[PDB]
Amino acid sequence: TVKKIEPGTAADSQQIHEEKLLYWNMAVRDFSILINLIKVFDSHPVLHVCLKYGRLFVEAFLKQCMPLLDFSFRKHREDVLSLLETFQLDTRLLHHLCGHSKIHQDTRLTQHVPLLKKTLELLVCRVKAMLT
């Protein structure tokens, strides 16, 4: 579903902007709590699918969401700034989770670990790029 949501334009009216952007807002806050729910759950399949699919979720966030940060910037600045402050805390939490991923030393997880790490570098540099 997160691949499907497209960024519109800067000249889009606020209502269509807000519905698809509030879908993105609930998406990133869903992502934050989806990161927060991992600290209670176990059974390495859980962390395995986390390391599989969270990667492509944040890739969708690169290609689809942050173009809206670039596009609806001049008019609705406060909402997107609240959203980015929502995302920085889960970014530091993702640093903690990546630390948790490295410390277990699993052979099945470690094929897609370094690929997820390069995607982590990609997502953080994309966050810094579209904040400008």
Side-chain angles (χ1 to χ4, degrees), residues 54-72:
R55 174 179 42 185
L56 300 102
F57 172 77
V58 308
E59 300 330 290
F61 212 85
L62 308 194
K63 71 182 210 163
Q64 303 300 73
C65 174
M66 284 191 280
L68 288 190
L69 176 60
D70 304 300
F71 285 152
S72 292

mmCIF file with all atom_site columns, all heavy atoms in Angstrom, residues 54-72:
data_model
loop_
_atom_site.group_PDB
_atom_site.id
_atom_site.type_symbol
_atom_site.label_atom_id
_atom_site.label_alt_id
_atom_site.label_comp_id
_atom_site.label_asym_id
_atom_site.label_entity_id
_atom_site.label_seq_id
_atom_site.pdbx_PDB_ins_code
_atom_site.Cartn_x
_atom_site.Cartn_y
_atom_site.Cartn_z
_atom_site.occupancy
_atom_site.B_iso_or_equiv
_atom_site.pdbx_formal_charge
_atom_site.auth_seq_id
_atom_site.auth_comp_id
_atom_site.auth_asym_id
_atom_site.auth_atom_id
_atom_site.pdbx_PDB_model_num
ATOM 1   N N   . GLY A 1 54 ? 10.253 -3.591 6.489  1.00 0.00 ? 54 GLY A N   1
ATOM 2   C CA  . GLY A 1 54 ? 10.491 -2.206 6.929  1.00 0.00 ? 54 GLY A CA  1
ATOM 3   C C   . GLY A 1 54 ? 11.424 -1.464 5.987  1.00 0.00 ? 54 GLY A C   1
ATOM 4   O O   . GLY A 1 54 ? 11.260 -0.252 5.799  1.00 0.00 ? 54 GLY A O   1
ATOM 5   N N   . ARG A 1 55 ? 12.370 -2.182 5.390  1.00 0.00 ? 55 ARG A N   1
ATOM 6   C CA  . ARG A 1 55 ? 13.289 -1.624 4.374  1.00 0.00 ? 55 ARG A CA  1
ATOM 7   C C   . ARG A 1 55 ? 12.486 -1.009 3.227  1.00 0.00 ? 55 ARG A C   1
ATOM 8   O O   . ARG A 1 55 ? 12.663 0.172  2.926  1.00 0.00 ? 55 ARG A O   1
ATOM 9   C CB  . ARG A 1 55 ? 14.173 -2.756 3.852  1.00 0.00 ? 55 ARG A CB  1
ATOM 10  C CG  . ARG A 1 55 ? 15.100 -2.410 2.691  1.00 0.00 ? 55 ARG A CG  1
ATOM 11  C CD  . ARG A 1 55 ? 15.953 -3.597 2.248  1.00 0.00 ? 55 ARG A CD  1
ATOM 12  N NE  . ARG A 1 55 ? 15.221 -4.865 2.200  1.00 0.00 ? 55 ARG A NE  1
ATOM 13  C CZ  . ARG A 1 55 ? 15.740 -6.064 1.941  1.00 0.00 ? 55 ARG A CZ  1
ATOM 14  N NH1 . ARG A 1 55 ? 17.032 -6.212 1.684  1.00 0.00 ? 55 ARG A NH1 1
ATOM 15  N NH2 . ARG A 1 55 ? 14.945 -7.125 1.941  1.00 0.00 ? 55 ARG A NH2 1
ATOM 16  N N   . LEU A 1 56 ? 11.601 -1.783 2.620  1.00 0.00 ? 56 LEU A N   1
ATOM 17  C CA  . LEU A 1 56 ? 10.843 -1.285 1.455  1.00 0.00 ? 56 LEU A CA  1
ATOM 18  C C   . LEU A 1 56 ? 9.800  -0.260 1.896  1.00 0.00 ? 56 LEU A C   1
ATOM 19  O O   . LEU A 1 56 ? 9.478  0.628  1.094  1.00 0.00 ? 56 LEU A O   1
ATOM 20  C CB  . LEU A 1 56 ? 10.200 -2.463 0.735  1.00 0.00 ? 56 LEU A CB  1
ATOM 21  C CG  . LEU A 1 56 ? 11.204 -3.502 0.226  1.00 0.00 ? 56 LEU A CG  1
ATOM 22  C CD1 . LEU A 1 56 ? 11.291 -4.740 1.114  1.00 0.00 ? 56 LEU A CD1 1
ATOM 23  C CD2 . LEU A 1 56 ? 10.873 -3.913 -1.196 1.00 0.00 ? 56 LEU A CD2 1
ATOM 24  N N   . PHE A 1 57 ? 9.332  -0.321 3.141  1.00 0.00 ? 57 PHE A N   1
ATOM 25  C CA  . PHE A 1 57 ? 8.474  0.757  3.675  1.00 0.00 ? 57 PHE A CA  1
ATOM 26  C C   . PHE A 1 57 ? 9.228  2.088  3.641  1.00 0.00 ? 57 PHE A C   1
ATOM 27  O O   . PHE A 1 57 ? 8.687  3.089  3.130  1.00 0.00 ? 57 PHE A O   1
ATOM 28  C CB  . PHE A 1 57 ? 8.001  0.458  5.095  1.00 0.00 ? 57 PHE A CB  1
ATOM 29  C CG  . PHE A 1 57 ? 7.292  1.631  5.718  1.00 0.00 ? 57 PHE A CG  1
ATOM 30  C CD1 . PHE A 1 57 ? 5.983  1.923  5.368  1.00 0.00 ? 57 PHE A CD1 1
ATOM 31  C CD2 . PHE A 1 57 ? 7.952  2.488  6.593  1.00 0.00 ? 57 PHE A CD2 1
ATOM 32  C CE1 . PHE A 1 57 ? 5.332  3.020  5.912  1.00 0.00 ? 57 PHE A CE1 1
ATOM 33  C CE2 . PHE A 1 57 ? 7.303  3.589  7.128  1.00 0.00 ? 57 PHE A CE2 1
ATOM 34  C CZ  . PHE A 1 57 ? 5.994  3.853  6.791  1.00 0.00 ? 57 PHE A CZ  1
ATOM 35  N N   . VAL A 1 58 ? 10.445 2.117  4.178  1.00 0.00 ? 58 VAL A N   1
ATOM 36  C CA  . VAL A 1 58 ? 11.189 3.398  4.262  1.00 0.00 ? 58 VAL A CA  1
ATOM 37  C C   . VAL A 1 58 ? 11.650 3.806  2.862  1.00 0.00 ? 58 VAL A C   1
ATOM 38  O O   . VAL A 1 58 ? 11.768 5.009  2.641  1.00 0.00 ? 58 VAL A O   1
ATOM 39  C CB  . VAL A 1 58 ? 12.353 3.368  5.272  1.00 0.00 ? 58 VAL A CB  1
ATOM 40  C CG1 . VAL A 1 58 ? 11.895 2.874  6.636  1.00 0.00 ? 58 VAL A CG1 1
ATOM 41  C CG2 . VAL A 1 58 ? 13.534 2.563  4.769  1.00 0.00 ? 58 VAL A CG2 1
ATOM 42  N N   . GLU A 1 59 ? 11.842 2.865  1.934  1.00 0.00 ? 59 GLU A N   1
ATOM 43  C CA  . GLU A 1 59 ? 12.132 3.235  0.528  1.00 0.00 ? 59 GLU A CA  1
ATOM 44  C C   . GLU A 1 59 ? 10.922 3.957  -0.071 1.00 0.00 ? 59 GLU A C   1
ATOM 45  O O   . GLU A 1 59 ? 11.119 4.957  -0.787 1.00 0.00 ? 59 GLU A O   1
ATOM 46  C CB  . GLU A 1 59 ? 12.513 2.025  -0.331 1.00 0.00 ? 59 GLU A CB  1
ATOM 47  C CG  . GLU A 1 59 ? 13.743 1.249  0.130  1.00 0.00 ? 59 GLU A CG  1
ATOM 48  C CD  . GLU A 1 59 ? 14.813 2.049  0.854  1.00 0.00 ? 59 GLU A CD  1
ATOM 49  O OE1 . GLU A 1 59 ? 15.489 2.872  0.206  1.00 0.00 ? 59 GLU A OE1 1
ATOM 50  O OE2 . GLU A 1 59 ? 14.948 1.870  2.075  1.00 0.00 ? 59 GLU A OE2 1
ATOM 51  N N   . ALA A 1 60 ? 9.706  3.493  0.220  1.00 0.00 ? 60 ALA A N   1
ATOM 52  C CA  . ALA A 1 60 ? 8.486  4.206  -0.212 1.00 0.00 ? 60 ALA A CA  1
ATOM 53  C C   . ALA A 1 60 ? 8.476  5.601  0.404  1.00 0.00 ? 60 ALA A C   1
ATOM 54  O O   . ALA A 1 60 ? 8.080  6.556  -0.279 1.00 0.00 ? 60 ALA A O   1
ATOM 55  C CB  . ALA A 1 60 ? 7.236  3.466  0.167  1.00 0.00 ? 60 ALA A CB  1
ATOM 56  N N   . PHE A 1 61 ? 8.906  5.706  1.658  1.00 0.00 ? 61 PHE A N   1
ATOM 57  C CA  . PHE A 1 61 ? 8.990  7.005  2.356  1.00 0.00 ? 61 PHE A CA  1
ATOM 58  C C   . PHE A 1 61 ? 9.970  7.928  1.636  1.00 0.00 ? 61 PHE A C   1
ATOM 59  O O   . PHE A 1 61 ? 9.722  9.142  1.577  1.00 0.00 ? 61 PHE A O   1
ATOM 60  C CB  . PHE A 1 61 ? 9.420  6.830  3.810  1.00 0.00 ? 61 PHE A CB  1
ATOM 61  C CG  . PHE A 1 61 ? 8.834  7.868  4.719  1.00 0.00 ? 61 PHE A CG  1
ATOM 62  C CD1 . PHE A 1 61 ? 7.574  7.687  5.261  1.00 0.00 ? 61 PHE A CD1 1
ATOM 63  C CD2 . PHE A 1 61 ? 9.524  9.039  4.997  1.00 0.00 ? 61 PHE A CD2 1
ATOM 64  C CE1 . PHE A 1 61 ? 7.022  8.649  6.089  1.00 0.00 ? 61 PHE A CE1 1
ATOM 65  C CE2 . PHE A 1 61 ? 8.973  10.000 5.828  1.00 0.00 ? 61 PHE A CE2 1
ATOM 66  C CZ  . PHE A 1 61 ? 7.725  9.802  6.378  1.00 0.00 ? 61 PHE A CZ  1
ATOM 67  N N   . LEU A 1 62 ? 11.051 7.369  1.102  1.00 0.00 ? 62 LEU A N   1
ATOM 68  C CA  . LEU A 1 62 ? 12.005 8.177  0.317  1.00 0.00 ? 62 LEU A CA  1
ATOM 69  C C   . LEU A 1 62 ? 11.292 8.666  -0.933 1.00 0.00 ? 62 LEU A C   1
ATOM 70  O O   . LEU A 1 62 ? 11.197 9.888  -1.129 1.00 0.00 ? 62 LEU A O   1
ATOM 71  C CB  . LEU A 1 62 ? 13.257 7.368  -0.039 1.00 0.00 ? 62 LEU A CB  1
ATOM 72  C CG  . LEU A 1 62 ? 13.948 6.671  1.136  1.00 0.00 ? 62 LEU A CG  1
ATOM 73  C CD1 . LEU A 1 62 ? 15.344 6.180  0.770  1.00 0.00 ? 62 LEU A CD1 1
ATOM 74  C CD2 . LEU A 1 62 ? 13.950 7.510  2.409  1.00 0.00 ? 62 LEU A CD2 1
ATOM 75  N N   . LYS A 1 63 ? 10.782 7.738  -1.737 1.00 0.00 ? 63 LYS A N   1
ATOM 76  C CA  . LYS A 1 63 ? 10.412 8.092  -3.122 1.00 0.00 ? 63 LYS A CA  1
ATOM 77  C C   . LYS A 1 63 ? 9.074  8.836  -3.142 1.00 0.00 ? 63 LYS A C   1
ATOM 78  O O   . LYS A 1 63 ? 8.878  9.611  -4.091 1.00 0.00 ? 63 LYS A O   1
ATOM 79  C CB  . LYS A 1 63 ? 10.427 6.858  -4.033 1.00 0.00 ? 63 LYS A CB  1
ATOM 80  C CG  . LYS A 1 63 ? 9.319  5.847  -3.814 1.00 0.00 ? 63 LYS A CG  1
ATOM 81  C CD  . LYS A 1 63 ? 9.423  4.636  -4.725 1.00 0.00 ? 63 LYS A CD  1
ATOM 82  C CE  . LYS A 1 63 ? 8.074  4.018  -5.048 1.00 0.00 ? 63 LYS A CE  1
ATOM 83  N NZ  . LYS A 1 63 ? 8.149  3.120  -6.226 1.00 0.00 ? 63 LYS A NZ  1
ATOM 84  N N   . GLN A 1 64 ? 8.194  8.630  -2.151 1.00 0.00 ? 64 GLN A N   1
ATOM 85  C CA  . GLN A 1 64 ? 6.799  9.129  -2.221 1.00 0.00 ? 64 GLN A CA  1
ATOM 86  C C   . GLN A 1 64 ? 6.495  10.238 -1.215 1.00 0.00 ? 64 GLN A C   1
ATOM 87  O O   . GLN A 1 64 ? 5.795  11.184 -1.601 1.00 0.00 ? 64 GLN A O   1
ATOM 88  C CB  . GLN A 1 64 ? 5.790  8.008  -1.981 1.00 0.00 ? 64 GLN A CB  1
ATOM 89  C CG  . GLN A 1 64 ? 5.890  6.818  -2.910 1.00 0.00 ? 64 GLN A CG  1
ATOM 90  C CD  . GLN A 1 64 ? 5.699  7.192  -4.361 1.00 0.00 ? 64 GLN A CD  1
ATOM 91  O OE1 . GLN A 1 64 ? 6.565  7.794  -4.995 1.00 0.00 ? 64 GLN A OE1 1
ATOM 92  N NE2 . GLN A 1 64 ? 4.549  6.831  -4.904 1.00 0.00 ? 64 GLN A NE2 1
ATOM 93  N N   . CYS A 1 65 ? 6.962  10.137 0.028  1.00 0.00 ? 65 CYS A N   1
ATOM 94  C CA  . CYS A 1 65 ? 6.456  11.006 1.118  1.00 0.00 ? 65 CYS A CA  1
ATOM 95  C C   . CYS A 1 65 ? 7.201  12.337 1.137  1.00 0.00 ? 65 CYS A C   1
ATOM 96  O O   . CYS A 1 65 ? 6.553  13.384 1.235  1.00 0.00 ? 65 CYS A O   1
ATOM 97  C CB  . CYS A 1 65 ? 6.590  10.320 2.469  1.00 0.00 ? 65 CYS A CB  1
ATOM 98  S SG  . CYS A 1 65 ? 6.144  11.385 3.865  1.00 0.00 ? 65 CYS A SG  1
ATOM 99  N N   . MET A 1 66 ? 8.522  12.280 1.071  1.00 0.00 ? 66 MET A N   1
ATOM 100 C CA  . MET A 1 66 ? 9.404  13.450 1.262  1.00 0.00 ? 66 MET A CA  1
ATOM 101 C C   . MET A 1 66 ? 9.359  14.391 0.057  1.00 0.00 ? 66 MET A C   1
ATOM 102 O O   . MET A 1 66 ? 9.612  15.585 0.221  1.00 0.00 ? 66 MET A O   1
ATOM 103 C CB  . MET A 1 66 ? 10.813 12.977 1.614  1.00 0.00 ? 66 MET A CB  1
ATOM 104 C CG  . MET A 1 66 ? 10.872 12.514 3.057  1.00 0.00 ? 66 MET A CG  1
ATOM 105 S SD  . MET A 1 66 ? 12.527 12.230 3.660  1.00 0.00 ? 66 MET A SD  1
ATOM 106 C CE  . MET A 1 66 ? 12.836 10.613 2.972  1.00 0.00 ? 66 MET A CE  1
ATOM 107 N N   . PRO A 1 67 ? 9.009  13.944 -1.170 1.00 0.00 ? 67 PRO A N   1
ATOM 108 C CA  . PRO A 1 67 ? 8.571  14.892 -2.196 1.00 0.00 ? 67 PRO A CA  1
ATOM 109 C C   . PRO A 1 67 ? 7.388  15.775 -1.779 1.00 0.00 ? 67 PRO A C   1
ATOM 110 O O   . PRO A 1 67 ? 7.358  16.917 -2.210 1.00 0.00 ? 67 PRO A O   1
ATOM 111 C CB  . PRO A 1 67 ? 8.222  13.993 -3.383 1.00 0.00 ? 67 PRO A CB  1
ATOM 112 C CG  . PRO A 1 67 ? 9.169  12.844 -3.229 1.00 0.00 ? 67 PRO A CG  1
ATOM 113 C CD  . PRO A 1 67 ? 9.219  12.598 -1.740 1.00 0.00 ? 67 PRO A CD  1
ATOM 114 N N   . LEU A 1 68 ? 6.456  15.279 -0.959 1.00 0.00 ? 68 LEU A N   1
ATOM 115 C CA  . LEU A 1 68 ? 5.402  16.158 -0.393 1.00 0.00 ? 68 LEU A CA  1
ATOM 116 C C   . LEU A 1 68 ? 6.024  17.141 0.604  1.00 0.00 ? 68 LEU A C   1
ATOM 117 O O   . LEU A 1 68 ? 5.526  18.275 0.688  1.00 0.00 ? 68 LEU A O   1
ATOM 118 C CB  . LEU A 1 68 ? 4.278  15.367 0.291  1.00 0.00 ? 68 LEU A CB  1
ATOM 119 C CG  . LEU A 1 68 ? 3.301  14.578 -0.582 1.00 0.00 ? 68 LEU A CG  1
ATOM 120 C CD1 . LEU A 1 68 ? 2.134  14.092 0.262  1.00 0.00 ? 68 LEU A CD1 1
ATOM 121 C CD2 . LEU A 1 68 ? 2.774  15.414 -1.734 1.00 0.00 ? 68 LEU A CD2 1
ATOM 122 N N   . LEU A 1 69 ? 7.064  16.737 1.337  1.00 0.00 ? 69 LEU A N   1
ATOM 123 C CA  . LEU A 1 69 ? 7.792  17.680 2.219  1.00 0.00 ? 69 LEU A CA  1
ATOM 124 C C   . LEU A 1 69 ? 8.424  18.783 1.371  1.00 0.00 ? 69 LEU A C   1
ATOM 125 O O   . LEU A 1 69 ? 8.442  19.935 1.829  1.00 0.00 ? 69 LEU A O   1
ATOM 126 C CB  . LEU A 1 69 ? 8.850  16.935 3.041  1.00 0.00 ? 69 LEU A CB  1
ATOM 127 C CG  . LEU A 1 69 ? 9.762  17.762 3.949  1.00 0.00 ? 69 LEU A CG  1
ATOM 128 C CD1 . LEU A 1 69 ? 8.974  18.524 5.002  1.00 0.00 ? 69 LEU A CD1 1
ATOM 129 C CD2 . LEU A 1 69 ? 10.797 16.857 4.604  1.00 0.00 ? 69 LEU A CD2 1
ATOM 130 N N   . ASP A 1 70 ? 8.917  18.445 0.181  1.00 0.00 ? 70 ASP A N   1
ATOM 131 C CA  . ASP A 1 70 ? 9.513  19.449 -0.729 1.00 0.00 ? 70 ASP A CA  1
ATOM 132 C C   . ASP A 1 70 ? 8.401  20.318 -1.316 1.00 0.00 ? 70 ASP A C   1
ATOM 133 O O   . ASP A 1 70 ? 8.598  21.540 -1.430 1.00 0.00 ? 70 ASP A O   1
ATOM 134 C CB  . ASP A 1 70 ? 10.335 18.797 -1.839 1.00 0.00 ? 70 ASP A CB  1
ATOM 135 C CG  . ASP A 1 70 ? 11.425 17.879 -1.324 1.00 0.00 ? 70 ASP A CG  1
ATOM 136 O OD1 . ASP A 1 70 ? 12.302 18.366 -0.583 1.00 0.00 ? 70 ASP A OD1 1
ATOM 137 O OD2 . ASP A 1 70 ? 11.387 16.688 -1.666 1.00 0.00 ? 70 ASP A OD2 1
ATOM 138 N N   . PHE A 1 71 ? 7.265  19.708 -1.662 1.00 0.00 ? 71 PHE A N   1
ATOM 139 C CA  . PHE A 1 71 ? 6.195  20.367 -2.445 1.00 0.00 ? 71 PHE A CA  1
ATOM 140 C C   . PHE A 1 71 ? 5.320  21.270 -1.565 1.00 0.00 ? 71 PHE A C   1
ATOM 141 O O   . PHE A 1 71 ? 5.219  22.469 -1.886 1.00 0.00 ? 71 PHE A O   1
ATOM 142 C CB  . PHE A 1 71 ? 5.417  19.349 -3.290 1.00 0.00 ? 71 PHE A CB  1
ATOM 143 C CG  . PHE A 1 71 ? 6.153  18.851 -4.512 1.00 0.00 ? 71 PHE A CG  1
ATOM 144 C CD1 . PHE A 1 71 ? 5.887  17.589 -5.026 1.00 0.00 ? 71 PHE A CD1 1
ATOM 145 C CD2 . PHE A 1 71 ? 7.121  19.624 -5.153 1.00 0.00 ? 71 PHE A CD2 1
ATOM 146 C CE1 . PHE A 1 71 ? 6.562  17.119 -6.145 1.00 0.00 ? 71 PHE A CE1 1
ATOM 147 C CE2 . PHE A 1 71 ? 7.794  19.152 -6.267 1.00 0.00 ? 71 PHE A CE2 1
ATOM 148 C CZ  . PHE A 1 71 ? 7.514  17.901 -6.765 1.00 0.00 ? 71 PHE A CZ  1
ATOM 149 N N   . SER A 1 72 ? 4.716  20.752 -0.493 1.00 0.00 ? 72 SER A N   1
ATOM 150 C CA  . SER A 1 72 ? 3.893  21.567 0.434  1.00 0.00 ? 72 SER A CA  1
ATOM 151 C C   . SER A 1 72 ? 4.768  21.983 1.613  1.00 0.00 ? 72 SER A C   1
ATOM 152 O O   . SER A 1 72 ? 4.668  21.385 2.707  1.00 0.00 ? 72 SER A O   1
ATOM 153 C CB  . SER A 1 72 ? 2.669  20.843 0.867  1.00 0.00 ? 72 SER A CB  1
ATOM 154 O OG  . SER A 1 72 ? 1.781  20.674 -0.227 1.00 0.00 ? 72 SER A OG  1
#
